[PDB]
């Protein structure tokens, strides 16, 4: 056999994997996925930082969806502080949690199309992802890595201008998905590339802890919304895709359905935002308006403190799962009660998937393997860390 | 943007495109907008605001201990009720 290192350099490798294969003629035998080419080691870097400082790190792991990561932190921090946010903040966190979900699935769709050489949808839809980055920029001042979701809730109130254009934005989008409906969804070549590839039995999934659509494609119905409507999801209407064959075609159609599903939800979140603070009343966690801090003393005092040593969590080490579109997400805090975490492991949903890939690798030809990475929505940033 | 070209375009489209403008023209929204004023906040009342009630972090308690390292009709019991059967999509039963 012929030993062969692959990426990072391949566009298919996404600049991260080095899964060496000891190929035969072209059928694989050995196929080990090395990792640690991106390992930023943030676990110790989280430890020496005040809990408000930890917040950027999560935009830094899921490159695409962003607000959901920070929400994944605000839930896990508010648990230990036992703090329950004003409702408007949660309607917002769902609203941009779902728009982040649109960005993430558009990402996975069009890139998976690129490895299949489709080219066009990419350019047909990033024209839209700039349309959304215009929005995170309108609410954060940054096109991406917006810090707008916070443990107290949110940095700032929504500008008056959005509420119309966002509707306008989704006034037409369904058609843009129709344009895909007229492609890969029906297209002949596409089925052959993906049909009956990387099928996974329900048990291996339940063993490795597969989650999200990666379960839902092979028929396991496990979900992190309706099982635990941790926010406004309990009020929100939507319905969950489940695959049949475990075909990548299945998982695909699921993601398209979830995109439809956010088309359903975001409608209702636009339909239902209360007036109210988008932040907690407490100045011992949530900082004062610039107007009030510059007259009232105590506001300026606690202002000075949260921005210097910050709120103090009561001591405790805990773990929380998150409904990332990619799967269960890991928030393993270890806090001595000091604003510095003692430790903080972060389970990436894609970690288990990549652990499971080699099971799906062997006995498949290389194009199958290139199909597989796109099967699992894996942004490698979260995975090694 | 000529109308015959619009006809032939929508023709190939199988869809009206004029019905969902793709390129974002005139409507958009105004950049320069009148000031937000913002919500007043629930607990800015002056009559009462003792920290003893609004506080949340104060209620935190270390976990109840059972069995611990130091110090027959039992009826086998679930940790929590077992997961329920879901509905089948209902309004769109199949894709």
């Amino acid at each position: 056999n012929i030993t062969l290192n692959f990426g990072p350099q391949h566009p298919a490798a996404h600049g991260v994997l080095r899964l060496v294969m000891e190929l035969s003629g072209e059928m694989v035998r050995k196929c080990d996925p090395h990792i640690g080419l991106l390992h930023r080691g943030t676990e110790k870097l989280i430890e020496y930082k005040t809990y408000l400082q930890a917040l950027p790190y999560f935009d830094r792991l899921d490159y695409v969806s962003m607000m959901c990561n920070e929400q994944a932190y605000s839930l896990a921090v508010e648990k230990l502080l036992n703090i329950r946010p004003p409702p408007r903040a949660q309607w917002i966190r769902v609203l941009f949690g779902e728009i982040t979900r649109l960005l993430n699935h558009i990402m996975a769709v069009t890139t998976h199309a690129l490895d299949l050489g489709a080219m066009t949808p990419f350019f047909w839809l990033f024209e839209e992802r700039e349309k959304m980055f215009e929005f995170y920029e309108r609410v954060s001042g940054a096109r991406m890595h917006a810090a707008y979701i916070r443990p107290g809730g949110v940095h700032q109130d929504l500008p008056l201008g959005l509420m119309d254009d966002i509707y306008q934005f989704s006034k037409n989008f369904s058609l843009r998905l129709d344009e895909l409906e007229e492609l890969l969804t029906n297209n002949r070549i596409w089925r052959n590339r993906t049909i009956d590839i990387g099928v996974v039995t329900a048990e291996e999934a339940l063993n490795y802890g597969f989650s999200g659509v990666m379960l839902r494609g092979s028929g396991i119905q496990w979900d992190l919304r309706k099982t635990q409507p941790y926010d406004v999801y309990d009020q929100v209407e939507f319905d969950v895709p489940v695959g049949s064959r475990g075909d990548c075609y299945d998982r695909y159609l699921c993601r398209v359905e979830e995109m439809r599903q956010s088309l359903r939800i975001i409608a209702q979140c636009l339909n239902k935002m209360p007036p109210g603070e988008i932040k907690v009343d407490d100045a011992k966690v949530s900082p004062p308006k610039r107007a009030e801090m510059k007259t009232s003393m105590e506001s300026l005092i606690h202002h000075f403190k949260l921005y210097t040593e910050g709120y103090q969590v009561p001591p405790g080490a805990t773990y929380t799962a998150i409904e990332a579109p990619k799967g269960e997400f890991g928030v393993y805090l270890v806090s001595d009660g000091s604003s510095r975490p003692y430790r903080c492991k972060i389970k990436a949903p894609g970690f288990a998937h990549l652990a499971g890939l080699d099971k799906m690798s062997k006995g498949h030809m290389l194009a199958d393997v290139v199909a597989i990475i796109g099967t699992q929505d894996i942004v490698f940033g979260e995975v090694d860390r | 943007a000529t109308r015959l070209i619009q006809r032939l375009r929508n023709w190939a489209s199988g869809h009206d495109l004029q019905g969902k403008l793709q390129l974002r023209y005139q409507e958009i929204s105004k950049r320069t907008q009148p000031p937000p004023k913002l919500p007043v906040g629930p607990s800015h009342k002056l009559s009462n605001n003792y920290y003893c009630t609004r506080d949340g972090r104060r209620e935190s308690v270390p976990p109840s201990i059972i069995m611990s390292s130091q110090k027959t009709e039992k009826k086998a019991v679930t940790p929590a009720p077992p997961i329920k059967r879901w509905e089948l999509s209902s309004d769109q039963p199949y894709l």
Partner: peptide, 22 residues
């Protein structure tokens, strides 16, 4: 003048696809 942006109305949108046979 208290305000912010709660919804102004919001008309119908269709998450449902259409794929005409034409």
């Amino acid at each position: 003048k208290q305000d912010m942006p709660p919804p102004g109305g919001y008309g119908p949108i269709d998450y449902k696809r259409n794929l005409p046979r034409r």
